[PDB]
């Protein structure tokens, strides 16, 4: 038992692996290939003397070739491989925007995001262990022999808890937890495709300088926040670990880090900040490499070069309802081929033998029209939802709603349930990039058919295209009259996380007007022969006369 009956759930993953994933393996290999450049730099920064710079360099290289560093490097490579796999489990092509504060809390408390927070906390503790070993000296070991017992009486050499090594390990755990929290709060798991494709090395060489500046500032905030956390709670791990291992505490040689005059130790604060810079920079290098390889373009053949490859083919890929990264890559290729390759437009207008039917166009146009009508209905249902303002299961629902209608009457809880208008507006357009590329793809093909379509194939669907574009422009220009549906969100320029999804609704309204204008500027007065509704013809004239 029971190896039968699910083949489509192979083939669909067996379309994803093809494509997206030598891209994954290349991203993992490059993430490991940057790790020696991060560890060389970490050792050179942890060994700084300002007086003997030739010995500083000598002894930094002497540690680098040591067999103990070659270990922690292999162990750190396994940590970077696992962190690169967690970027491959948790990615999203659509940004998971929380429409209320209770939805933001319910996002963070999700069991898979909790699992991600525990595993990143463990990987942060292991990376801080490697680092505390790599820095040698007082950061060496969690257990150290008691440096005071000249009292002749027993020869069991007594063991103290190294509070500095404990502070390192616990900072690593807090940094890994904080990274995972920030990952789902900022939507760093979002894959924004670039508005401009660029060679991988330029795209990375530009982001790396912004990253190292961000890691340095974010490590400084995480250390500052952990220093406040440890001042209120550090005793609890300290007393739990001393009792759980029967370890002593050296009240004579070391000032306890619960004290402000231990916790202000500048050498500790430097090496712990530098550890946080190494951690954040190596983890964000994995994220940036994955984000670069997973938003590189792909090319899909329109006509199959061989019949067995034809699952490949752009018109079949679109209709298959594939995983959303493939449906986005296919519509990105449709938007690139319709502008920048005439031969691949002639593959779309071609009639398929024997039956003479335009199967390539009548697949591509049909699914682009399905998506545009899907957005028209998604806008109508939101405008309506803006004009309108066994017995155990129904008892649970009636009690859940009686509870909602008692909790909403309390200001402190209303403040958590409240639907943020901006966030709900951004949630409606959260997938709009797919619809922009279906629109830009189709409106370039309808512009090119006026000189490339030797079969008139595109003019047979032109009335249905103009109807769906004008009824969508109506839905957008009914929607943009709503309160807050016209205000632009405040932006920070030069963030490492992107915010494009917040303004994407203005891009959809801008692209729809340029798509209608493109078709009125290629057909001109021939559009007066096109059968359409009298209100749609009256708008089509306003796009011929340049009045919008």
């Amino acid at each position: 038992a029971t190896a039968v009956s699910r083949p489509c759930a192979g083939r669909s993953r067996d379309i994803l692996w093809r494509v997206l994933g030598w891209r994954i393996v290349a991203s993992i290999v490059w993430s490991v290939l940057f790790l020696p450049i991060c560890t060389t730099v970490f050792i050179i920064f942890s060994r700084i003397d300002l007086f003997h710079p030739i010995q500083w360099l000598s002894d930094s290289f002497s540690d680098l070739y040591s067999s103990y560093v070659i270990f922690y490097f292999l162990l750190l490579s396994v940590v970077i491989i696992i962190i690169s796999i967690f970027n491959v489990e948790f990615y999203a092509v659509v940004p998971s925007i929380p429409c209320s504060r209770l939805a933001l809390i319910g996002k963070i408390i999700h069991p898979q995001q909790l699992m991600h927070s525990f595993i990143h906390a463990a990987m942060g503790m292991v990376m801080a262990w490697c680092a505390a070993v790599i820095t040698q000296g007082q950061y060496s070991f969690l257990v150290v022999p008691c440096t005071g017992t000249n009292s002749f009486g027993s020869p069991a050499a007594q063991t103290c808890l190294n509070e500095y090594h404990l502070f390192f390990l616990l900072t690593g755990a807090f940094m890994g937890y904080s990274y995972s929290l920030l990952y789902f709060v900022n939507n760093m798991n979002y894959l924004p495709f670039p508005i401009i494709q660029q060679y991988k090395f330029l795209r990375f060489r530009r982001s790396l300088l912004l990253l190292v500046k961000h890691s340095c500032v974010e490590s400084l905030f995480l250390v500052r926040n952990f220093c406040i956390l440890y001042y209120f709670l550090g005793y609890i791990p300290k007393a739990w670990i001393s009792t759980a291992m029967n370890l002593h505490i050296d009240e004579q040689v070391h000032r306890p880090l619960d004290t402000v005059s231990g916790l202000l130790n500048l050498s500790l604060l430097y090496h712990v900040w530098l550890c946080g810079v190494f951690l954040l920079t190596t983890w964000y290098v994995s994220w940036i490499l994955f984000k670069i390889y997973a938003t590189e373009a792909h090319v899909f053949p329109v006509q199959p070069p061989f019949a067995e490859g034809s699952d490949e083919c752009l018109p079949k890929v679109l209709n298959s309802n594939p995983p959303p990264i493939i449906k986005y890559l296919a519509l990105q290729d449709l938007m690139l081929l319709s502008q920048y390759s005439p031969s691949r437009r002639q593959e779309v207008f071609s009639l398929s033998q024997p039956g003479g039917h335009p199967h390539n166009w009548t697949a591509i146009s049909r699914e682009c029209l399905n998506l545009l009508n899907g957005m028209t209905q998604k806008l109508i249902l939101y405008q309506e939802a803006a004009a309108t303002n066994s017995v155990i299961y129904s008892w649970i629902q009636n009690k859940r709603e009686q509870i909602k209608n008692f909790l909403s009457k309390r200001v402190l809880i209303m403040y958590f349930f409240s639907k943020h208008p901006e966030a709900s507006i951004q949630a409606v357009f959260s997938d709009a990039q797919m619809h922009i590329w279906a629109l830009e793809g189709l409106s370039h093909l309808v512009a090119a058919s006026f000189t490339e379509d030797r079969f008139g194939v595109v003019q047979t669907t032109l009335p249905a295209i103009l109807n769906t574009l004008l009824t969508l422009q109506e839905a957008v220009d009914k929607y943009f009259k709503l309160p807050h549906a016209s205000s632009k969100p405040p932006r920070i320029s030069g963030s490492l996380v992107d915010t494009s999804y917040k303004t994407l609704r203005f891009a959809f309204r801008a692209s729809l007007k340029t798509a209608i204008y493109r078709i009125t500027t290629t057909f001109g007065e021939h559009l007066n022969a096109v059968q359409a509704s009298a209100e749609h013809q009256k708008r089509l004239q306003q796009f011929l006369e340049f009045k919008e």
Binding site: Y340, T514, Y517, R518, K547, E548
Partner: protein, 383 residues
């Protein structure tokens, strides 16, 4: 071609009114940031001219004019009402660019920002509100000298001679994407090809860079004596004309079409070509020797590809160093030809400050000329 093949300039006091039958018919009438704008402006005397920039709308009988007071005015053949655009950040205007596939959107280059004005195409008030002016800026990209929209309307470019990266703007998502290269200078002018597949970028140095709008690759052109001063694309995007400061030469560079897959490379021929000479000649006129020759300060091609207008600037040994408009007839197939048509001349004491063609004139071509008198003329070329 060479200047020794042109017909004579019109007799002193006549004005060129139009072209007809290939003849020019005449009649009796119709640095700091600021010196750095004056070095790279399209206007021959930007620091003393009343008129700093002119731009046609890419489909309609609407035009925008930047003035010495940093107003931009908008004129329309179907409106006696002329809007006066003035923002608090609008200073030392260097360039104007209308958005294609849009009735209502104008970009303006300023000393401290780019301003995107939205103008209600039915309701053109005499002074639109400062809310109708979206501000774009980036630390170090100042002053802005040139602006170039993509033909598809979805992207805007900007240039600054201080900044070693072209700035691509999405005006709708409000994103900024620098295109940094590795030394050379900053950017002086920017020109898309009409297909939207290529972009010329010029620098203060003896180097230009051509770019690809698909893969955002760069192809370098460093075997020049001086800076690339100006240039124009052919209507098909298959040819680029350019001129070099210190050389009286019109170069042409070809780009064959991508009959082949799999690589973003800009794709120019390995060499440019010399097609016209502007060396220091004499022409005999009823008024004596006239002397012609100098440096091509601006070049503009018609949308039809049959007329090339060249704004030559004389050396201070030739017509006192006055600027002159040459008109060439062009052919793009099967060979690239430049034939002379003639010499375009204005009011006695006017000097041509700017030239440009109309983008949608259904009767041959229409040349807009901005004169030092502050007059604009519109010279039709009937073919």
């Amino acid at each position: 071609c060479s200047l020794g093949l042109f017909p004579p300039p019109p007799p002193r006091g006549q004005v060129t009114l139009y072209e007809h039958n290939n003849e020019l018919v005449t009649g009796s009438s119709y640095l700091r940031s600021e010196d750095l704008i004056a070095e790279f402006a399209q206007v021959t005397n930007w620091s003393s001219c009343c008129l700093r920039v002119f731009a046609w709308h890419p489909h309609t009988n609407k035009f925008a004019v930047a003035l010495l007071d940093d107003s931009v005015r908008v004129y329309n053949a179907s409106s006696t009402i002329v809007p006066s655009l003035k923002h608090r950040l609008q200073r030392n205007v260097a360039s104007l660019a209308w958005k294609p596939l849009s009735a209502s959107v104008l970009a303006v280059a300023c000393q401290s920002c780019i301003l995107i004005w939205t103008l209600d195409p039915t309701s053109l008030s005499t002074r639109p509100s400062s809310g109708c002016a979206q501000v774009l800026s980036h630390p170090g990209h100042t002053p802005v000298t040139s602006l170039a929209w993509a033909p598809s309307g979805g992207r805007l470019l900007s240039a600054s001679p201080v900044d070693a990266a072209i700035r691509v703007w999405d005006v709708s998502t409000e994103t900024c994407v620098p295109l940094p290269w590795f030394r050379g200078g900053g950017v002086t002018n920017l020109l898309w090809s009409p297909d939207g597949s290529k972009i010329l970028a010029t620098t203060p140095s003896a180097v230009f860079r051509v770019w690809e709008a698909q893969m955002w690759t760069c192809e370098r052109w460093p075997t020049l004596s001086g800076r690339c001063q100006t240039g124009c694309w052919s209507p098909d995007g298959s040819r680029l004309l350019f001129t070099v400061l210190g050389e009286p030469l019109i170069y042409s560079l070809s780009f064959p079409e991508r009959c082949g897959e799999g690589k973003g490379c800009v794709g120019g021929a390995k060499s440019a070509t010399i097609v016209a000479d502007l060396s220091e000649t004499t022409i005999q006129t009823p008024d004596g020797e006239e002397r012609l020759g100098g440096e091509a300060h601006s070049m503009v091609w018609d949308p039809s590809g049959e007329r090339l207008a060249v704004l030559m600037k004389g050396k201070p040994r030739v017509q006192d160093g006055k600027p002159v408009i040459l008109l060439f007839r062009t052919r793009n197939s099967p060979v690239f030809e430049l034939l002379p048509c003639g010499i375009i001349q204005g009011e006695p004491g006017a000097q041509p400050q700017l030239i440009t063609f109309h983008p949608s004139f259904n009767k041959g071509a229409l040349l807009s000329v901005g004169w030092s008198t502050g007059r604009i003329a519109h010279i039709p070329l009937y073919f």
